[PDB]
Design an enzyme around this catalytic site. Structure first.
Site, PDB file in Angstrom:
ATOM      1  N   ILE A 173       0.841  -1.159   0.098  1.00  0.00           N
ATOM      2  CA  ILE A 173      -0.112   0.072  -0.123  1.00  0.00           C
ATOM      3  C   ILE A 173       0.731   1.308   0.000  1.00  0.00           C
ATOM      4  O   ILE A 173       1.962   1.364   0.726  1.00  0.00           O
ATOM      5  CB  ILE A 173      -0.841   0.056   1.188  1.00  0.00           C
ATOM      6  CG1 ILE A 173      -2.280   0.971   1.116  1.00  0.00           C
ATOM      7  CG2 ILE A 173      -0.103   0.418   2.586  1.00  0.00           C
ATOM      8  CD1 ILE A 173      -3.205   0.785   1.920  1.00  0.00           C
ATOM      9  N   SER A 187       2.953  -7.500   0.797  1.00  0.00           N
ATOM     10  CA  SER A 187       1.798  -7.048   1.505  1.00  0.00           C
ATOM     11  C   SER A 187       0.630  -6.966   0.858  1.00  0.00           C
ATOM     12  O   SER A 187       0.003  -7.893   0.438  1.00  0.00           O
ATOM     13  CB  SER A 187       2.367  -5.605   2.285  1.00  0.00           C
ATOM     14  OG  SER A 187       1.595  -5.303   3.493  1.00  0.00           O
ATOM     15  N   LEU A 188       0.030  -5.782   0.575  1.00  0.00           N
ATOM     16  CA  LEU A 188      -1.055  -5.580  -0.488  1.00  0.00           C
ATOM     17  C   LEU A 188      -1.043  -6.689  -1.540  1.00  0.00           C
ATOM     18  O   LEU A 188      -2.004  -7.079  -1.887  1.00  0.00           O
ATOM     19  CB  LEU A 188      -1.468  -4.128  -0.700  1.00  0.00           C
ATOM     20  CG  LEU A 188      -2.413  -3.796  -1.875  1.00  0.00           C
ATOM     21  CD1 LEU A 188      -3.725  -4.298  -1.523  1.00  0.00           C
ATOM     22  CD2 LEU A 188      -2.263  -2.322  -2.312  1.00  0.00           C
ATOM     23  N   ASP A 191       5.045 -11.233   3.698  1.00  0.00           N
ATOM     24  CA  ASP A 191       4.602 -10.479   4.574  1.00  0.00           C
ATOM     25  C   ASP A 191       3.293 -10.179   4.705  1.00  0.00           C
ATOM     26  O   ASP A 191       2.772  -8.942   4.851  1.00  0.00           O
ATOM     27  CB  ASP A 191       5.609  -9.393   4.790  1.00  0.00           C
ATOM     28  CG  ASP A 191       5.716  -9.255   6.337  1.00  0.00           C
ATOM     29  OD1 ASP A 191       6.409 -10.138   6.795  1.00  0.00           O
ATOM     30  OD2 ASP A 191       5.239  -8.337   7.184  1.00  0.00           O
ATOM     31  N   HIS A 240       8.752  -5.719   8.293  1.00  0.00           N
ATOM     32  CA  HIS A 240       7.673  -5.789   7.394  1.00  0.00           C
ATOM     33  C   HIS A 240       8.182  -5.797   5.926  1.00  0.00           C
ATOM     34  O   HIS A 240       7.684  -6.304   4.757  1.00  0.00           O
ATOM     35  CB  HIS A 240       6.419  -5.096   7.583  1.00  0.00           C
ATOM     36  CG  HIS A 240       5.403  -4.732   6.559  1.00  0.00           C
ATOM     37  ND1 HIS A 240       4.752  -5.905   6.267  1.00  0.00           N
ATOM     38  CD2 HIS A 240       4.891  -3.809   5.775  1.00  0.00           C
ATOM     39  CE1 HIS A 240       3.958  -5.587   5.209  1.00  0.00           C
ATOM     40  NE2 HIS A 240       4.048  -4.265   5.116  1.00  0.00           N
TER      41      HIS A 240
END
Ligand SMILES: [Cl-]
Ligand SMILES: [Cl-]
Lengths: 268, 268
Positions: free
Chosen positions: A31, A96-97, A120, A248
């Site tokens: 993001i 992530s996203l 992650d 992260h």
């Protein structure tokens, strides 16, 4: 070395960065980020794969619809892009996203995706961790005086990310506007994307039939060790990699180990 | 539909069970065990792989020299088998002794091996654990009235192993002798092999350049959680799979999760 172009995939138009030849391998950022953060990693796999990084909806130089920022929305974008590129099923590398999007896509479009490297982002993430992500998601939505101010801001928000990576984000995700620089990412898109990240990801990991490598950063503040443990219990068969010294931001903070983990995965 | 034959690899002659076609995939058993324990798993990969389970030196129907049961000996056998078979680099799926032998071989002969699935045998195994294994192996050398007595004994020695798998061990590991049944495995070989399993394995895991999937049973008494944790810090890039509700005998106790983990790895 990478050529950028906006690809009309019907449902929307996305900006991408391409290079190399061979089986298709798509990269999806986290993001507020954008496709450029993957160039260092892609150059390393370009001789064997057609590496393409995608600015996802609401980000970079891609379309920014008024709404539609849930898992399915991003997932359908991926299927559309794989079909439009028509270069065969793709290996999805997401952070992530991007990771959440790739696993959702793989579970919904088995045939379009060969395998996923989910960096992650697993199910079971605790509310507090998502509260944190949501609270500072638009901390970047401001007018920066110059690129130096952008790097200062970034270095401070991502203390463990290497200067080189900070500079890459600084030059790629912020454009000259009236009076200075501003984020390319739409603030409304971010706010909607952030709360969309709270949705139950269990069905997606439970039903995905294609290979998925789970990568977690040892000190990640988004995916806790407890979260990974539950995920592995849900899908004990999915190979796992925990990167030491990484938070992260695994791929940016630990480029070498990340690379080796990917090559161990797809080359087995 | 397996085809068994004794293959002369020069340095020694070994018995193997073969089935299927395609890329070569070799299976190696644990100490005192033999190639028959893999038939149920091979049946599942026969369609796209040329699956071959090997009776390693001193075991099953293979040659049982008086000496030479160190990692290097077991590893040089694997190299000779791949060269003699002449069918391209092979995928090495080994259990315990077999896993130890396979990583060793991978580190020493990178071009002969595509990848390795090391089931339950990492470096750092604590001394007390190797002592218990050694004690059990040497105590196995005895006379049994009949097959029923053998089945009872094996079941008591491996309480978690399913009855169907116990039967396989009972029907394939013994020879008719005066007084009933005795193991086919050479006792001298087992004693020496067990002793050799204590050798330092860090070198092999540290220098191996081909993909390696580390698989541990959640309640394995041979590979402790600490040993795995230490192995992962030595090689954080190697993907890991931990099987819940499985002890040291992962492939026999959890065949489905085992198969799935193998395919996620090689099909990525
Ligand atoms: Cl994110
Ligand atoms: Cl063993």
């Amino acid at each position: 070395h990478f050529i950028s172009r906006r690809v009309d995939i019907g449902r929307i138009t996305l900006n991408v960065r391409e290079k190399g030849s061979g089986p298709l391998m798509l990269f999806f950022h986290g993001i507020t980020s954008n496709s450029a953060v993957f160039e260092p990693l892609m150059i390393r796999l370009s001789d064997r794969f057609t590496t393409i990084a995608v600015d996802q909806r609401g980000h970079g130089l891609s379309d920014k619809p008024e709404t539609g920022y849930e898992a399915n929305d991003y997932a359908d974008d991926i299927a559309g892009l794989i079909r439009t590129l028509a270069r065969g099923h793709a290996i999805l590398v997401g952070h992530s996203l991007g990771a959440r999007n790739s696993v959702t896509a793989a579970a919904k479009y088995p045939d379009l995706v060969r395998s996923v490297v989910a960096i992650d982002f697993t199910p079971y993430i605790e509310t507090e961790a998502l509260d944190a992500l949501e609270a500072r998601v638009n901390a970047g939505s401001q007018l920066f005086e110059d690129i130096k101010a952008v790097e200062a801001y970034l270095a401070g928000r991502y203390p463990n990310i290497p200067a080189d990576a900070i500079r890459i984000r600084a030059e790629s995700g912020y454009q000259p506007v009236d009076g200075g620089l501003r984020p390319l990412a739409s603030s409304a898109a971010m706010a909607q994307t952030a709360r969309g990240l709270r949705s139950d990801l269990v069905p997606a990991y439970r039903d995905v039939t294609k290979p998925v490598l789970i990568v977690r950063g040892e000190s990640s503040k988004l995916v806790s060790a407890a979260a990974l443990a539950k995920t592995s219990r849900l899908r004990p068969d999915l190979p796992v990699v925990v990167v030491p010294g990484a938070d992260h931001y695994v791929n940016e903070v630990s480029p070498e180990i990340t690379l080796k983990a990917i090559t161990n995965f797809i080359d087995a």
